[PDB]
Design an enzyme around this catalytic site. Structure first.
Site, PDB file in Angstrom:
ATOM      1  N   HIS A  62      -1.789   1.906 -18.956  1.00 14.28           N
ATOM      2  CA  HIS A  62      -0.922   0.757 -19.145  1.00 14.28           C
ATOM      3  C   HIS A  62      -0.797  -0.079 -17.877  1.00 14.28           C
ATOM      4  O   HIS A  62      -0.324  -1.215 -17.947  1.00 14.28           O
ATOM      5  CB  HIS A  62       0.434   1.160 -19.744  1.00 14.28           C
ATOM      6  CG  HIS A  62       1.397   1.818 -18.799  1.00 14.28           C
ATOM      7  ND1 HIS A  62       1.586   3.183 -18.749  1.00 14.28           N
ATOM      8  CD2 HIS A  62       2.306   1.281 -17.945  1.00 14.28           C
ATOM      9  CE1 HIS A  62       2.537   3.456 -17.870  1.00 14.28           C
ATOM     10  NE2 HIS A  62       2.999   2.318 -17.372  1.00 14.28           N
ATOM     11  N   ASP A  93      -2.968   7.520 -22.316  1.00 18.64           N
ATOM     12  CA  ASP A  93      -2.541   6.582 -21.288  1.00 18.64           C
ATOM     13  C   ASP A  93      -3.123   6.951 -19.921  1.00 18.64           C
ATOM     14  O   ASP A  93      -2.448   6.835 -18.906  1.00 18.64           O
ATOM     15  CB  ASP A  93      -1.016   6.473 -21.204  1.00 18.64           C
ATOM     16  CG  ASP A  93      -0.538   5.244 -20.460  1.00 18.64           C
ATOM     17  OD1 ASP A  93      -1.325   4.298 -20.250  1.00 18.64           O
ATOM     18  OD2 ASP A  93       0.678   5.229 -20.097  1.00 18.64           O
ATOM     19  N   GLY A 139       7.339   1.164 -11.557  1.00 16.92           N
ATOM     20  CA  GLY A 139       6.275   1.046 -10.586  1.00 16.92           C
ATOM     21  C   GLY A 139       5.785   2.373 -10.049  1.00 16.92           C
ATOM     22  O   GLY A 139       4.936   2.395  -9.156  1.00 16.92           O
ATOM     23  N   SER A 198       4.670   4.918 -12.280  1.00 18.03           N
ATOM     24  CA  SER A 198       3.684   5.524 -13.163  1.00 18.03           C
ATOM     25  C   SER A 198       2.363   5.712 -12.409  1.00 18.03           C
ATOM     26  O   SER A 198       2.007   4.922 -11.539  1.00 18.03           O
ATOM     27  CB  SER A 198       3.464   4.684 -14.413  1.00 18.03           C
ATOM     28  OG  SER A 198       2.776   3.479 -14.162  1.00 18.03           O
TER      29      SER A 198
HETATM   30  C1  TSV Z   1       7.235   7.276 -24.364  1.00 19.10           C
HETATM   31  C2  TSV Z   1       8.762   7.068 -24.538  1.00 19.10           C
HETATM   32  C3  TSV Z   1       9.496   8.429 -24.452  1.00 19.10           C
HETATM   33  C4  TSV Z   1       9.078   6.338 -25.868  1.00 19.10           C
HETATM   34  O1  TSV Z   1       9.299   6.342 -23.425  1.00 19.10           O
HETATM   35  C5  TSV Z   1       8.866   5.070 -23.163  1.00 19.10           C
HETATM   36  O2  TSV Z   1       8.009   4.464 -23.730  1.00 19.10           O
HETATM   37  N1  TSV Z   1       9.611   4.549 -22.079  1.00 19.10           N
HETATM   38  C6  TSV Z   1       9.243   3.323 -21.472  1.00 19.10           C
HETATM   39  C7  TSV Z   1      10.415   2.785 -20.668  1.00 19.10           C
HETATM   40  C8  TSV Z   1      10.050   1.440 -19.966  1.00 19.10           C
HETATM   41  C9  TSV Z   1      11.192   1.003 -19.004  1.00 19.10           C
HETATM   42  C10 TSV Z   1      10.769   1.240 -17.521  1.00 19.10           C
HETATM   43  C11 TSV Z   1      10.724   2.745 -17.208  1.00 19.10           C
HETATM   44  C12 TSV Z   1      10.351   2.911 -15.742  1.00 19.10           C
HETATM   45  C13 TSV Z   1       9.232   3.491 -15.319  1.00 19.10           C
HETATM   46  C14 TSV Z   1       8.118   4.104 -16.148  1.00 19.10           C
HETATM   47  C15 TSV Z   1       7.073   5.006 -15.613  1.00 19.10           C
HETATM   48  C16 TSV Z   1       6.632   3.666 -16.134  1.00 19.10           C
HETATM   49  C17 TSV Z   1       6.252   2.704 -15.050  1.00 19.10           C
HETATM   50  O3  TSV Z   1       6.724   2.750 -13.937  1.00 19.10           O
HETATM   51  N2  TSV Z   1       5.249   1.797 -15.422  1.00 19.10           N
HETATM   52  S1  TSV Z   1       4.853   0.766 -14.242  1.00 19.10           S
HETATM   53  O4  TSV Z   1       5.991  -0.121 -13.950  1.00 19.10           O
HETATM   54  O5  TSV Z   1       4.275   1.394 -13.081  1.00 19.10           O
HETATM   55  C18 TSV Z   1       3.635  -0.247 -15.014  1.00 19.10           C
HETATM   56  C19 TSV Z   1       2.812  -1.098 -14.041  1.00 19.10           C
HETATM   57  C20 TSV Z   1       2.179   0.094 -14.751  1.00 19.10           C
HETATM   58  N3  TSV Z   1       6.005   3.619 -17.399  1.00 19.10           N
HETATM   59  C21 TSV Z   1       6.376   2.684 -18.375  1.00 19.10           C
HETATM   60  O6  TSV Z   1       7.030   1.724 -18.117  1.00 19.10           O
HETATM   61  C22 TSV Z   1       5.861   3.018 -19.763  1.00 19.10           C
HETATM   62  C23 TSV Z   1       4.793   1.988 -20.301  1.00 19.10           C
HETATM   63  C24 TSV Z   1       5.024   1.982 -21.680  1.00 19.10           C
HETATM   64  O7  TSV Z   1       4.563   3.211 -22.311  1.00 19.10           O
HETATM   65  C25 TSV Z   1       3.238   3.188 -22.638  1.00 19.10           C
HETATM   66  O8  TSV Z   1       2.481   2.298 -22.545  1.00 19.10           O
HETATM   67  N4  TSV Z   1       2.886   4.440 -23.109  1.00 19.10           N
HETATM   68  C26 TSV Z   1       1.471   4.717 -23.664  1.00 19.10           C
HETATM   69  C27 TSV Z   1       1.522   6.059 -24.014  1.00 19.10           C
HETATM   70  C28 TSV Z   1       0.431   6.935 -24.581  1.00 19.10           C
HETATM   71  C29 TSV Z   1       0.731   8.372 -24.849  1.00 19.10           C
HETATM   72  C30 TSV Z   1       2.092   8.940 -24.594  1.00 19.10           C
HETATM   73  C31 TSV Z   1       3.136   8.052 -24.021  1.00 19.10           C
HETATM   74  F1  TSV Z   1       4.355   8.514 -23.734  1.00 19.10           F
HETATM   75  C32 TSV Z   1       2.830   6.616 -23.761  1.00 19.10           C
HETATM   76  C33 TSV Z   1       3.750   5.533 -23.179  1.00 19.10           C
HETATM   77  C34 TSV Z   1       6.561   1.974 -21.875  1.00 19.10           C
HETATM   78  N5  TSV Z   1       6.905   2.898 -20.681  1.00 19.10           N
HETATM   79  C35 TSV Z   1       8.126   3.569 -20.479  1.00 19.10           C
HETATM   80  O9  TSV Z   1       8.245   4.285 -19.529  1.00 19.10           O
END
Ligand code: TSV
Ligand code: ZN
Length: 198
Positions: free
Chosen positions: A76, A100, A156, A158
């Site tokens: 992502h 992912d 940020g 992930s």
């Molecule tokens: C799964 C569940 C329980 C429903 O929760 C969530 O969907 N929650 C959200 C909460 C978002 C709020 C911010 C949270 C803060 C930090 C988060 C770590 C982070 C991040 O830092 N990205 S980033 O800024 O570096 C970015 C620059 C790279 N990732 C995200 O945002 C991810 C991205 C997106 O998810 C996915 O695309 N997938 C694809 C998957 C495939 C398989 C299994 C999975 F689970 C998958 C999850 C939504 N995301 C969450 O986390």
């Protein structure tokens, strides 16, 4: 039209999370203008060190972690992008949208973490600000924060690692489990999935 179609830039290493000593800290190795240029050319001659890199595209910044000679991150953040390297762009060697997960050959100079074989549930998450956050493992791909945090604190990060007490890689941080903007738990890609991918 065909002749004017653009290409996406490369992912660029812009810094690292230094874990080598007694103090964890983020280090920047390239500023924003250099990042933009390097993303376009795919040519990055900077020295790489360490296990956890800070990476950027033109639009996002996140982490990447070397485990068993592969620099791993989240799809992502990286999509299908190449990574910039001294010899030009390097194509992903692993891409799995279902997990992912993406990976490239680890850059020369990086150090790799070893997959954990401890079978233990007391973990540590490393953020892009070099916070080391205790996490209790709660399932194959979930752990709870001992001290919940606003999601702003995790954004940020992930692509970064969850580690065992001995510093082995247990997983790659993927998603935050939040309610009302507070992260009480995290979702991660277990290291065994990476090992199977390899
Ligand atoms: C799964 C569940 C329980 C429903 O929760 C969530 O969907 N929650 C959200 C909460 C978002 C709020 C911010 C949270 C803060 C930090 C988060 C770590 C982070 C991040 O830092 N990205 S980033 O800024 O570096 C970015 C620059 C790279 N990732 C995200 O945002 C991810 C991205 C997106 O998810 C996915 O695309 N997938 C694809 C998957 C495939 C398989 C299994 C999975 F689970 C998958 C999850 C939504 N995301 C969450 O986390
Ligand atoms: Zn271990």
């Amino acid at each position: 039209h065909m002749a004017s179609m653009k290409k996406k830039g490369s992912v660029v290493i812009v810094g690292r999370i230094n874990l080598s000593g007694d103090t964890a800290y983020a280090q920047q190795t390239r500023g924003e203008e250099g990042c933009q240029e390097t993303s376009q050319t795919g040519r990055d001659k900077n020295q790489v060190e360490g296990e956890v890199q800070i990476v950027s595209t033109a639009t996002q910044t996140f982490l990447a972690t070397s485990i068993n000679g592969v620099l791993w991150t989240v799809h992502h953040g990286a999509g299908t992008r190449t990574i910039a390297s001294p010899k030009g762009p390097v194509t992903q060697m692993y891409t799995n949208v279902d997990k992912d997960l993406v990976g490239w050959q680890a850059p020369q100079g990086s150090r790799s973490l070893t997959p954990c074989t401890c079978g233990s549930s007391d973990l540590y998450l490393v953020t892009r600000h070099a916070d080391v956050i205790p996490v209790r493992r709660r399932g194959d791909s979930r752990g709870s924060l001992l001290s919940p945090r606003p999601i702003s604190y995790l954004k940020g990060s992930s692509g970064g690692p969850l580690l065992c007490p001995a510093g082995h890689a247990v997983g790659i941080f993927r998603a935050a489990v939040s309610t009302r903007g507070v992260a009480k738990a995290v979702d991660f890609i277990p290291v065994e999935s990476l090992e199977t991918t390899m």
